[PDB]
Write a protein that binds this ligand. Structure first.
Ligand SMILES: Nc1ccc(-c2c3ccc(=O)cc-3oc3cc(O)ccc23)c(C(=O)O)c1
Ligand SMILES: O=C(O)CCC(=O)C(=O)O
Ligand SMILES: [Mn+2]
Length: 432
């Protein structure tokens, strides 16, 4: 396989024909005011130690990301990538001053790229011959900031299909975005085919290593845009240059189950089955209808694994840049605590003498999948907090396996290990 750069005559026609949805707006087209401001913001944020490598999970393997990052965006919003839920350090939509200033900066960058994107989608629709679709597909709600110093890596991976050389980030799609939403990137480089010293973004068509890929050079302050279905039909990578580089990748996160407000509302829904006169250990339930119980235990898992464990796995490295999620995480944890009491109550009702076995088996069938999953995921999370590489990470932001309590701890109604309880309930349902 081979690739094209501006050095090739075919590059330009290839781009115009097979990539009308990829746009480049060079540093020139953006005000020097903005450049200085966002570059300063990157640099303060780096100096404050705000960007972290993530301890992600891909195809069974625990991996540190070579790139270090921080998520910034709408308050209460989250972005899930490579099985890791990033929580926004918030920007001032309708903290240590400096850090708050940088977030405001990236908010205005966001406004600018949003305008540019709408503009480009308008021109794109015009060449193809509804403005709600356009504005929603450009309504960026977060940006994921990236940093890599390539001299810090002992050995970089070779781009395997087209000879593009060294890769900072492998071929992928930006995942979990609103359908056909655009992606806008501000690239900031600290400065026989593609020049190894310059950073490039690479592109290929999915499934296809015969059509030569493109490597677009990125100089300081250059911006690129992926429009409409480009991010789905094509893969992209990042090709390392000689110097360090920052980037700001503004996206429309699909967040329909990804906001604080959403998960709080799910918790409230589970707790509608609970007599709520008073908050004590005496949890009593309004109903034991299978469908209501299933839902409650499903929500129990949702808040526990998508929110609590995800959050605390990141070693609380937010209080380094914000405390916005502190009380929300305390509130969710308490809501999850009550839900522990709920599961206990359901177990108590199952073991109760005087319950017709038909109603007992109706309940078991409703909750077994949830308690099973709660066991399996709890093991995964516990392993993932010990493991090989979790060893190394600085104790100042190393994975905490929260919530966690010992067998001896009697502030909690149930044990962390549910294996006994799962076997016992699975046996009863087979009792013929
Ligand atoms: N240790 C690593 C962990 C993750 C990735 C990586 C990927 C590695 C493999 C892959 O198929 C997709 C990847 O997508 C990424 C997206 C990001 O925003 C950041 C990193 C990746 C990589 C990589 O780029 O090869 C290495
Ligand atoms: O930095 C870029 O240009 C693309 C962003 C990216 O691939 C990433 O790190 O998620
Ligand atoms: Mn990317």
């Amino acid at each position: 396989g081979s690739h094209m750069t501006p050095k090739d005559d075919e590059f330009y026609q290839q781009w115009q024909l097979k990539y009308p949805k990829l746009i480049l707006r060079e540093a020139s087209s953006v005000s020097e005011e903005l450049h200085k401001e966002v570059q300063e913001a990157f640099l303060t944020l780096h100096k404050h130690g705000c960007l972290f490598r993530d301890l992600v999970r891909i195809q069974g393997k625990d991996l540190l990301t070579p790139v270090s990052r921080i998520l910034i965006g709408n308050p209460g919003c989250t972005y899930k990538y490579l099985n890791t839920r990033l929580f926004t350090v918030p920007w001032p939509v309708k903290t240590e001053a400096e850090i708050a200033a940088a977030c405001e900066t990236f908010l205005k960058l966001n406004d600018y790229l949003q305008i540019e994107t709408i503009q480009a989608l308008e021109e794109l629709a015009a060449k193809e011959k509804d403005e709600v679709d356009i504005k929603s597909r450009a309504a960026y709600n977060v940006t994921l900031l990236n940093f890599m110093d390539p001299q810090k890596m002992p050995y970089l991976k070779e781009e395997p299909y087209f000879g593009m050389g060294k890769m900072a980030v492998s071929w992928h799609h930006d995942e979990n975005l609103v359908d056909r939403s655009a992606v806008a990137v501000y690239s900031y480089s600290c400065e026989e085919g593609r020049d190894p010293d310059i950073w490039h973004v690479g592109f290929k068509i999915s499934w296809d290593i015969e059509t030569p890929g493109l490597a677009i050079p990125l100089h300081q302050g250059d911006c690129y845009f992926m429009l409409d279905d480009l991010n789905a039909t094509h893969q992209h990578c990042v090709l390392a240059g000689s110097q360090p580089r920052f980037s700001s990748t503004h996206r429309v996160a699909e967040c329909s189950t990804g906001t604080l407000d959403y998960i709080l509302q799910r918790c409230q829904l589970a707790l509608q089955n609970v007599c709520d006169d008073v908050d004590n250990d005496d949890v009593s339930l309004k109903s034991f209808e299978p469908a209501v119980l299933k839902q409650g235990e499903e929500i129990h898992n949702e808040v526990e694994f998508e929110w609590l464990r995800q959050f605390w796995f990141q070693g609380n490295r937010y209080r380094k840049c914000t405390d916005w999620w502190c009380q929300p995480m305390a509130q969710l944890e308490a809501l999850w605590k009550k839900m522990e009491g709920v599961t206990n109550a359901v177990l108590h009702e199952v073991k109760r003498e005087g319950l017709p076995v038909e109603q007992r088996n109706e309940i078991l069938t409703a909750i077994l999948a949830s308690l099973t999953a709660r066991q399996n995921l709890r093991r995964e999370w516990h392993a993932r907090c010990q493991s090989r590489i979790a060893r190394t990470l600085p104790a100042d932001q190393k994975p905490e396996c929260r919530p966690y309590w010992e067998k001896d701890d009697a502030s909690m109604p149930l044990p962390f290990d549910l294996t006994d309880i799962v076997s016992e309930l699975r046996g009863q349902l087979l009792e013929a």
